[PDB]
Amino acid sequence: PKKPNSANRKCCRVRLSTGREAVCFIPGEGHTLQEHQIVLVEGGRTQDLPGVKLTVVRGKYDCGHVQK
């Protein structure tokens, strides 16, 4: 993230149904997303990540819920 925040935000590049490649943040602690997996991505920018304006919807398609 940009200053003054510091972290390793879990992001993934995905090709959308519109044919456009975009970077989507993966919220929640821990994820098992892999190549060729299908996700549902919604809006809502990640504030500390420049250029990231999408977010993976946890609990839909291959992206499971956050494991307690």
């Binding site: 090709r15 044919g19 602690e29 821990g30 994820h31 098992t32 190549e35 060729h36 499971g64 819920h65 494991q67």
Partner: protein, 511 residues
């Protein structure tokens, strides 16, 4: 979470039990006459009308001799699960042997696993077959075994009547009875997507009577039965136990071999939801482990698969999973599905630079044009081994060329000279060619008492103050290397060689 799962009913009461037809599955090796025997029983010919004369699907047919449900399992090694599914659902197994092979042994093992009676059919007629089967725990009545052996000739239609008589006798001995009333219990034999009838499942009813409008659940899927048809496509108003049926109306496509249970009403969904949740939990546990394992720390062929039926897709995926040449080339399965090649498959292949493989599925002109525009390669096959060969060819294409080194000549150094040319001291090795010849174009390597010192091409080949391209055997030649760091001794050796690129074939074997 509360358990809302729909479970199989307890074993039917003896009073409620009613005699039913038998389910007989024909199993055996490739080209052992299973399809021909089934054609003779069915009074119709379909072995001739096939792609390559190979049974690639498990089909159930209600034959009227009495009535029996014959299941034609494929004999190929690819569709092992298919055969297993038949063994799981059958009551009697007709093991067809041409006058014992690997797939026959596998089918025998499946029948033993399922604890089902076996009737041997010696097609193309025998004693040698029974003696061999003695090793595989298939003992004939001539050898004191329960298994009945019938020599038959399917092509000429000989002795088939006695085979049917033995099947009927074994069915009568088994006394197959089931409850023809109450909630329906059955098993999926196949599932596919018809462009007109939606998601369709070929199933076999095990208990209860299925009727239009019955709400069924199978795995993560559920349906409100919309059309029940037979093999000929005609609608049937009821589906008694031990009756094949094509059921339409599935909201999602069930996996082959999944049990089907009838429920009270659609708000079924809950049951499906519960099952989904269970699966998620299982995956979640695995996910948790993997995630924890991470948190404590802190030549790529991509293939799309589109098949006509889920069973064929499963067989192809099992074949793919038997890939063991990941070191030379990595085979990634981007996406597998059921049905004709579609826009999503083309987009996925384009995204990952993959290749679409279509087993018994089509691709319209629009789809083909889109794939050509996007550089996607669609490969449609109708035979499983053809698809396997094509996949092997693609994998070999992905493999890098293999360089073959052929020795051309050999020369031994005699003297070392220092020539002053262009203000530069060039070390020159006086070499005598012992065997073969040395060529300027061909590469060279330096050998020091068996050790390999240098590998490359000469910067200058010169003999008797004249440049000669090829020096014959016994000809002296001064050799100069491009590498100045190389030291030339009195006893060094030089081996010339020609390097030719050769096509490399994949080490993976489908068997």
């Amino acid at each position: 979470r509360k358990n809302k799962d729909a479970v199989r009913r307890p074993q039917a009461d003896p009073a409620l039990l009613t005699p039913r037809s038998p389910v007989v599955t024909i199993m055996g090796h490739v080209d052992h006459g299973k399809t021909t025997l089934l054609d003779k029983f069915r009074k119709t010919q379909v072995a001739a009308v096939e792609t390559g004369g190979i049974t690639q699907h498990i089909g159930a047919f209600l034959v009227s001799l009495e009535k029996i449900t014959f299941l034609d399992t494929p004999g190929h090694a690819a569709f092992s699960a298919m055969r297993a599914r038949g063994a799981q659902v059958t009551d009697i197994v007709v093991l067809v042997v041409a006058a014992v092979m690997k797939q026959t042994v596998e089918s025998i093992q499946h029948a033993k696993d399922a604890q089902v009676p076996i009737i041997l059919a010696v097609n193309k007629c025998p004693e040698k077959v029974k003696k061999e089967l003695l090793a595989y725990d298939v003992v004939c009545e001539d050898y004191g075994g329960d298994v009945q052996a019938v020599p038959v000739s399917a092509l000429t239609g000989d002795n088939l009547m006695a085979l049917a008589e033995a099947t009927v006798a074994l069915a009568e001995m088994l006394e197959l009875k089931a409850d023809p009333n109450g909630p329906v219990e059955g098993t999926v034999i196949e599932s596919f997507t018809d462009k007109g009838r939606g998601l369709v499942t070929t199933a076999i009813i095990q208990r209860g009577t299925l009727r239009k409008g019955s709400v069924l659940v199978a795995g993560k899927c559920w349906a409100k039965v919309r059309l029940m048809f037979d093999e000929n496509g005609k609608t049937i108003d009821e589906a008694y136990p031990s009756m094949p049926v094509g059921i339409t109306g599935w909201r999602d496509l069930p996996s082959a071999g999944e049990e089907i249970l009838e429920v009270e009403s659609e708000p079924a969904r809950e049951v499906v939801d519960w099952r989904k949740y269970e699966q998620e939990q299982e995956k979640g546990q695995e996910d948790l482990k993997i995630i924890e394992e991470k948190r404590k720390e802190h030549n790529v062929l991509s293939v799309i698969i589109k098949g006509d039926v889920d069973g064929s897709v499963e067989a192809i995926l099992n074949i793919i999973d038997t890939y063991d040449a990941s070191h030379e080339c990595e085979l990634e399965l981007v996406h597998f599905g059921v049905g004709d090649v579609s826009a999503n498959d083309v987009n996925l292949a384009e995204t990952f630079d993959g290749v679409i493989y279509g087993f018994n599925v089509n691709a319209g002109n629009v789809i083909q044009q889109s794939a050509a525009k996007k550089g996607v390669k669609i490969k449609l096959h109708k035979i499983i081994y053809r698809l396997v060969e094509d996949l092997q060819e693609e994998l070999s294409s992905r493999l890098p060329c293999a360089v073959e080194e052929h020795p051309v000549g050999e020369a031994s150094i005699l003297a070392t000279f220092s020539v002053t040319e262009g203000k530069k001291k060039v070390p020159v090795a006086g070499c005598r060619v012992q065997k073969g010849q040395l060529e300027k174009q061909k590469k060279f390597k330096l050998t020091r008492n068996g050790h390999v010192i240098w590998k490359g091409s000469l910067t200058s080949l010169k003999h008797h103050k004249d440049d000669i391209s090829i020096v014959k055997t016994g000809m002296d030649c001064g050799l100069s290397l491009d590498e100045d760091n190389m030291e030339f001794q009195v006893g060094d050796r030089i081996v010339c060689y020609e390097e030719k690129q050769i096509q490399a074939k994949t080490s993976w074997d489908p068997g």
